[PDB]
Amino acid sequence: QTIQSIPQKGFFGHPRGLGVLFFVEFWERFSYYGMRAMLIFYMYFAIHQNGLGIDKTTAMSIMSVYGALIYMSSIPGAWIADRITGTRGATLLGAVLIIIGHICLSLPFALFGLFSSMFFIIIGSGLMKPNISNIVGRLYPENDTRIDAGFVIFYMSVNLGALISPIILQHFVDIRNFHGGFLLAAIGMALGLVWYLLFNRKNLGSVGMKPTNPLSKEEKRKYGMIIGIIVAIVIVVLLVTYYTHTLSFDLISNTVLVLGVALPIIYFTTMLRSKDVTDGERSRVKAFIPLFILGMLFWSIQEQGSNVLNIYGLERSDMQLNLFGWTTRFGEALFQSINPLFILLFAPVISMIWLKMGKKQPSLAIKFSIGTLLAGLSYILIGLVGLGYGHTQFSVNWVILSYVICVIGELCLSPTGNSAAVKLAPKAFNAQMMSVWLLTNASAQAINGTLVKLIKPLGQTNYFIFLGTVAIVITLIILVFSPKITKA
Numbered sequence: 169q170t171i172q173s174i175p176q177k178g179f180f181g182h183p184r185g186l187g188v189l190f191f192v193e194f195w196e197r198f199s200y201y202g203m204r205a206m207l208i209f210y211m212y213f214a215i216h217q218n219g220l221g222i223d224k225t226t227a228m229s230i231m232s233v234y235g236a237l238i239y240m241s242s243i244p245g246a247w248i249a250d251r252i253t254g255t256r257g258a259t260l261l262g263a264v265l266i267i268i269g270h271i272c273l274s275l276p277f278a279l280f281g282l283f284s285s286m287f288f289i290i291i292g293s294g295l296m297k298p299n300i301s302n303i304v305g306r307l308y309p310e311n312d313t314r315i316d317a318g319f320v321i322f323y324m325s326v327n328l329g330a331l332i333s334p335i336i337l338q339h340f341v342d343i344r345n346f347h348g349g350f351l352l353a354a355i356g357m358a359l360g361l362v363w364y365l366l367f368n369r370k371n372l373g374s375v376g377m378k379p380t381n382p383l384s385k386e387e388k389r390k391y392g393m394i395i396g397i398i399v400a401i402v403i404v405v406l407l408v409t410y411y412t413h414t415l416s417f418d419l420i421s422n423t424v425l426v427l428g429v430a431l432p433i434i435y436f437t438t439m440l441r442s443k444d445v446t447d448g449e450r451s452r453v454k455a456f457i458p459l460f461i462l463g464m465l466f467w468s469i470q471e472q473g474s475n476v477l478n479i480y481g482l483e484r485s486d487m488q489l490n491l492f493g494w495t496t497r498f499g500e501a502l503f504q505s506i507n508p509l510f511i512l513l514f515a516p517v518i519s520m521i522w523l524k525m526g527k528k529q530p531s532l533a534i535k536f537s538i539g540t541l542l543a544g545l546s547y548i549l550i551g552l553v554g555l556g557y558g559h560t561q562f563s564v565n566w567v568i569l570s571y572v573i574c575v576i577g578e579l580c581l582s583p584t585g586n587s588a589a590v591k592l593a594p595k596a597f598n599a600q601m602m603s604v605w606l607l608t609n610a611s612a613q614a615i616n617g618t619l620v621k622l623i624k625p626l627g628q629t630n631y632f633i634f635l636g637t638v639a640i641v642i643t644l645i646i647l648v649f650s651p652k653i654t655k656a
């Protein structure tokens with residue numbers, strides 16, 4: 169049995185093994201969102217300043233390409249746990265890969281060590297991020313109503329890592345010792361691994377040690393042919409372009425652009441088709457299409473506060489926090505800590521707003537429209553500030569006020585799109601619907617990987633006013649069809 173092997177208690181009233189993976193996902197997401205927050209500055213900083221010296225636009229662009237691939241790679245890694253390794257194996261493999269990628273940035277490998285890092289982390293992330301989340305659900309038996317808060321606590325380490333690590337890592341940016349910071353994250357990740365190795369056998373029991381739908385003899389051949397070849401075609405066209413000096417990041421940034429727009433369509437096409445989706449569950453899939461837009465428009469802006477907003481604040485504002493007499497230097501890595509901090513504070517409190525309303529709750533597109541409008545309004549804010557002040561160095565107060573408006577928008581849109589991801593998924597294409605909602609984050613990130621090239625031609629300020637406006641315009645449009653979508 170799956171639930172007879174594992175302790176049903178031991179961690180704030182939940183199964184002991186939720187204590188094991190909290191400590192694992194904490195030390196992973198800590199070193200991820202830490203690395204993720206130096207990395208931008210390790211790229212477009214000058215060589216004398218220990219950086220690498222990459223074009224400001226290639227560096228902003230890597231950031232969104234790197235991001236999107238973290239989330240696309242959850243799709244084959246959900247698969248490899250499903251057909252070859254099982255959830256446990258994939259997570260262990262994923263973790264060991266990640267630590268390799270962090271160690272790479274610690275070594276002085278300049279442009280090679282950067283991408284080998286991206287390679288090793290992206291790989292392990294898809295084997296770990298989605299399959300660690302699988303194992304936590306499988307710890308609760310079929311009719312166990314604890315599973316709900318058990319995921320709230322799990323994702324609480326997610327925000328705890330992502331809160332604490334920009335804080336700590338801020339010093340290695342000031343003393344411009346990038347290598348040393350990537351080593352801290354690197355260790356921090358190993359802590360998680362050691363802890364899993366030491367205590368995974370006894371708290372997780374036998375869960376996910378075997379794959380669910382393993383591959384038959386002929387499937388091992390078919391798939392190992394197909395997958396084998398694409399790996400070859402890819403390798404070659406990289407090899408070919410490196411040694412003919414054709415290769416830049418426009419190859420990668422355009423590929424992913426393509427995937428990020430291709431992959432949502434396939435999923436809705438293979439979904440809306442098939443006679444396995446009744447007339448009830450269909451049309452509802454046509455009703456998530458609009459929501460998928462509003463989730464794409466939203467995460468566009470949100471995930472840009474990791475490569476666009478924070479550069480703008482470092483270069484265009486006084487970087488001096490200034491609240492009711494409390495002034496201090498606002499460290500630039502500290503921008504990536506607002507977004508989790510307000511989640512950790514106000515995830516429980518936007519939970520009461522919807523519970524005290526019961527049925528007069530906002531609809532579902534209503535949330536999705538609220539949270540896209542705000543993110544939209546948030547880019548209109550910072551654009552207008554820059555437009556008012558012009559050349560004069562304004563307060564970093566304003567740059568923070570954008571981040572906040574955005575994270576308040578997410579409070580309506582993050583808890584709803586994943587409540588609704590695998591809520592009304594077709595009672596056959598459930599995972600296929602998990603993969604949809606997640607792509608709201610991956611497509612935004614592949615669109616951003618190319619969207620940022622409009623900064624030079626439109627100017628840093630006007631950029632901000634164009635994006636905020638497509639968000640609000642296109643949101644209001646969909647809001648007129650907001651009763652038809654609600655019929656579901």
Ligand SMILES: CC(C)[C@H](N)C(=O)OCCOCn1cnc2c(=O)[nH]c(N)nc21
Binds near residue numbers: 323326330508511586
């Ligand atoms: C900048 C970051 C701190 C960012 N706001 C953040 O908290 O990212 C969380 C990492 O993404 C995974 N994740 C977090 N919450 C959820 C969630 O609620 N559902 C799913 N499927 N994935 C989630």
